[PDB]
Amino acid sequence: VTASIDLQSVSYTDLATQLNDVSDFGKMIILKDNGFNRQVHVSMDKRTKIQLDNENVRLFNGRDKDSTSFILGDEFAVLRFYRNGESISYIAYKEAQMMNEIAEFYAAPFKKTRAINEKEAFECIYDSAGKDIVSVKINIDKAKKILNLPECDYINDYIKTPAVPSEPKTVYVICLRENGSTIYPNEVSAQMQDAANSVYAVHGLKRYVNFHFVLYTTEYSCPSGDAKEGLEGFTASLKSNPKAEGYDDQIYFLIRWGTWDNKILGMSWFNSYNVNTASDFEASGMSTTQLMYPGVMAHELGHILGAEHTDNSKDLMYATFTGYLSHLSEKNMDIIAKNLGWEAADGD
């Protein structure tokens, strides 16, 4: 038979054993729900590398028609796809204690919600007298609609700074866990994957960049709730660190779970990265990493690469949070690409 994944009982080892079988030529996997039955061709994502505290995390793609991606570490796995245009994540941690802590973490915002409603946005998956949770299913769009939280945004999240290569250039995206913050691996890896993929989708840019995210902790924490103050302070702290000398031409993100003052989701120095002139830790920003707000790091990385705000509410670079993950602006596409070495004579 074709290999299949039962989404009604999907566990970490389900996802690990399936993805670990994906050879260099890809593999067909059936995504199997009740009568719902999508077949996807899965491949290794060779564009992007990720360590989280030196733990190696691998990405997997479907074809474009599949609208499907995976994340796999030793500790956790993620499947994300779209059904009727809604982002749905299956999240499964390997260790039972961590999986329960994750399931209680995602259930707690619904503690006042009617259970009838809740099963649309958030659902525990159990092992086939107390049940064992092997994964959770989140529909963030439905989640937002059920919890009806106040909207966040990015209104003022950028400050004015300060041939085809034979192989892509490696750009490190060095992410730093703010001192004191509680950060979960499935949520950070999802931001990283989305950030990198929003770039590769533009002008065939994988020929020019292969992003390499790493994550460690920093002693720095924001002195206030003010995002500008925080980024100013964070850039200063990169120049102070001797453990970072020699790496002033990479990209730097301070990361946390919550937002800053005025529901601001992130901040970065505008148009501060260029593959020829990057210097002095200028290509730095901050980013929220919570699951309800996909695409934030992508949005901030776009700014770092020159992309401006746009007036389409389906664009990644809309000034209000939208959930959307793709650059729609031809102006932004050209300048981001230009900053990574691309010219129109190169084609896509």
Partner: nanobody, 120 residues
Framework: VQLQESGGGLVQAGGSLRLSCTYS????????MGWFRQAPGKERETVAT????????QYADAVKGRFTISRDNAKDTVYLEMNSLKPEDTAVYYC??????????????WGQGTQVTVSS
């Protein structure tokens, strides 16, 4: 975001019109722009599309050599200059902002549309 065409109306064959399309919105320069047309009982067709910075253009075969698309990012307006009009150029003419590139993108915000009638 709001788009307004203007400059249409009656014109005799061989004459000339100059449509203008005004963009009320904050990031006119973010988007490629296009002109489209639809005659009664006929499918809509693309007439011309233009770069976000006006430097690159693409024309439908039936209008190449006769129509010129331009944009003024300085005034937030896109233009269609139409010369040597033929009866078959009669249609409602719409402008639109588009997602993606000027060559493979998709119109998203449409104008009211202006009427162009070429007589014989």
């Amino acid at each position: 975001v709001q788009l307004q065409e203007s400059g249409g109306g009656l014109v005799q064959a061989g004459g000339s019109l100059r449509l203008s399309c005004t963009y009320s919105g904050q990031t006119f320069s973010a988007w490629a722009m296009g002109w489209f047309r639809q005659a009664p009982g006929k499918e809509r067709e693309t007439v011309a599309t233009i770069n976000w910075n006006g430097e690159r253009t693409q024309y439908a075969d039936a209008v190449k050599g006769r129509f010129t698309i331009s944009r003024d990012n300085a005034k937030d307006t896109v233009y269609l200059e139409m010369n040597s009009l033929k009866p078959e150029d009669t249609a409602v003419y719409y402008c639109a902002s588009m997602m993606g590139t000027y060559y493979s993108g998709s119109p998203k915000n449409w104008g009211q549309g202006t009427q162009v009638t070429v007589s014989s």
